[PDB]
């Protein structure tokens, strides 16, 4: 039958000194299976369920590398949004991202997700057609404009269409 995989990433800037608080959590069907936390004693990806401990050590290392990579991405783009919305340098803000795939019974992609939110408001999201973007406001249109010119929709669609579906298949087997 149908299956799904979702990843939720959130970065929250803090007043005062200190980098943003970043968190990443993944879900299979609707069960948390992986999690990363920047404010952890040992920041790294870790299994949340027994059937995830069967992944090689190198699996969790390179995947934790993506975390650090994603974390820096959220750091740089939190600053970009402060300028787009002309916000005071003194405040807390949260940039969020959700991405994933739903797979039908035939094993093929049923629906793909790639959407971002800023301070609890939708910013930009990949439409179900996986070809166009919905830009909530004028600031989002700056991003959408540059993403249409760079063919970002196809880029993300490639992942959702292949890797997302393939890894969901693997996880379900284990």
């Amino acid at each position: 039958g149908p299956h799904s995989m979702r990843y939720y990433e959130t970065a929250t800037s803090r007043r005062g000194l200190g980098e943003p608080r970043y968190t990443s959590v993944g879900y299979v069907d609707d069960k948390e299976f992986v999690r990363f936390d920047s404010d952890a004693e040992n920041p790294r990806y870790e299994p949340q369920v027994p059937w995830m401990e069967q992944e090689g050590p190198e699996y969790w290392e390179r995947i934790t590398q993506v975390a650090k990579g994603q974390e820096q991405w959220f750091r740089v783009n939190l600053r970009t949004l402060l300028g787009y919305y002309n916000q005071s340098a003194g405040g807390t803000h949260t940039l969020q991202r959700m991405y994933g795939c739903d797979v039908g019974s035939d094993g093929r992609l049923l629906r793909g997700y790639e959407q971002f939110a800023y301070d609890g408001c939708d910013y930009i999201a990949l439409n179900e057609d996986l070809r166009t973007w919905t830009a909530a406001d004028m600031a989002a249109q700056i991003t959408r404009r540059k993403w249409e010119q760079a063919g970002a929709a196809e880029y993300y669609r490639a992942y959702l269409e292949g890797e997302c579906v393939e890894w969901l298949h693997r996880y379900l087997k284990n």
Binding site: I63, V66, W73, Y123, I124, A150, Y156, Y159, W167
Partner: peptide, 9 residues
């Protein structure tokens, strides 16, 4: 596996 790094906003 995780998706590739997204383009910049």
């Amino acid at each position: 596996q995780l998706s590739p790094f997204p383009f910049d906003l």
